[PDB]
Write a protein that binds this ligand. Structure first.
Ligand SMILES: [Cl-]
Ligand SMILES: [Zn+2]
Lengths: 61, 295
């Protein structure tokens, strides 16, 4: 990926991926919370929105 | 489930249900000076609110800080070795434990320590009571007893509260702040609130799994208590992450079947906040923060 690839296999991000997949409507709220808690992560997401969205939407067991 | 970790999820899920007995809750309040705790909390909010520099609010948050303080200074005592029952003198641990007569079984003691007096040639018994009701009588122990009894008390006062189990043999509590819309770390044994890096950065603990348990939720809260996520991952060798998460997911889904739609919806909106925290590891400050001892 780009800089955000290291999120992919983190157990807490696997959890996040699962939740966003089951609850698409939480996407705006997720991005807004990221902006508050981790603005640098948001800045990275804004530069590579597709990659982030791709990662969120990859199924995990 | 034959890993010890998965066995303790089940035990702790059960145990936490104990705080929901409304008579046990009553009796807990039989012990707490709840009005004075609340009268002192109103006063700090009064003066915090004079200088609007103090934003949002904090109110039941102020109350929480009064609870932590009292528990530590008025309610509960630490045990290293108990005094001798015959001569009042010092005792010393026997490496070989005692056997829970019967009344010690009734109150959840599986372990009983032999605190021996050499002068009297006398064994003094220190039971490790697991029934929080017993602890409201004895008012003492080590951090097992402190966290167990403190979590009962929080629930008795109407705080949402988790019993928090650390795989490295410590336990504590978390309490929800509606004002700040987030969960707060609380360690009664240590008189600390909202300092989640205390264990890794203050005590230099090498953490692996920290699991929180409430009436509503089982949550892997490990990531709140670490800024060294790769290092913690290197010690998570006890179970597959897949299996741990499916087990917790299963347990949540199962246990949340008997909550409302609106409540489940709220829990989902809140979980976004935690999970964003869990991918937002913080920066240690050993040169600034009194409780920070490690880079
Ligand atoms: Cl901290
Ligand atoms: Zn003695």
């Amino acid at each position: 990926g780009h800089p955000l690839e290291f999120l992919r296999n983190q157990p807490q991000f696997q959890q996040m991926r699962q939740i966003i997949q089951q609850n698409p409507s939480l996407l705006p709220a997720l991005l807004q919370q990221i902006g508050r808690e981790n603005p640098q992560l948001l800045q990275q997401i804004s530069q590579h929105q597709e990659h982030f969205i791709q990662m969120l939407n990859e199924p995990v067991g | 489930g034959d890993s010890t970790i998965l066995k303790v999820l089940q035990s702790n899920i059960q145990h936490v249900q104990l705080y929901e007995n409304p008579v046990l809750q009553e009796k807990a309040l039989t012990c707490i000076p709840v009005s004075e705790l609340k009268r002192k909390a109103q006063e700090k909010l009064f003066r915090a609110r004079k200088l609007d520099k103090g934003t949002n609010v904090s109110d039941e948050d102020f109350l929480l800080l009064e609870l932590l303080h009292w528990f530590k200074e008025e309610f509960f005592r630490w045990v290293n070795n108990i005094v001798c029952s015959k001569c009042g003198g010092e005792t010393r641990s026997r490496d070989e434990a005692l056997l829970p007569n019967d009344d010690e079984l009734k109150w959840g003691a599986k372990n009983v320590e032999n605190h021996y007096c050499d002068a009297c040639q006398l064994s003094n018994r220190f039971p490790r009571y697991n029934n929080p009701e017993k602890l409201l009588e004895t008012r003492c122990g080590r951090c097992g007893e402190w966290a167990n009894c403190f979590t009962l008390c929080c629930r008795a006062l109407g705080f949402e509260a988790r019993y928090v189990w650390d795989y490295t043999d410590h336990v504590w509590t978390e309490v929800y702040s509606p004002s700040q819309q987030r969960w707060l770390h609380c360690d009664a044994c240590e008189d600390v609130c909202d300092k989640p890096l205390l264990y890794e950065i203050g005590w230099g603990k090498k953490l692996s799994y920290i699991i929180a348990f409430s009436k509503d939720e089982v949550v892997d809260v490990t990531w709140r208590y670490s800024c060294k996520h790769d290092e913690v991952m290197s010690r998570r060798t006890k179970v597959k992450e897949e299996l741990l998460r499916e087990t917790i997911n299963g347990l949540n889904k199962q246990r949340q079947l008997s909550l409302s739609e609106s409540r489940r919806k709220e829990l989902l909106q809140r979980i976004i906040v935690e999970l964003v925290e869990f991918i937002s590891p913080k920066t240690p400050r050993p040169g600034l923060e009194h409780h920070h001892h490690h880079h």
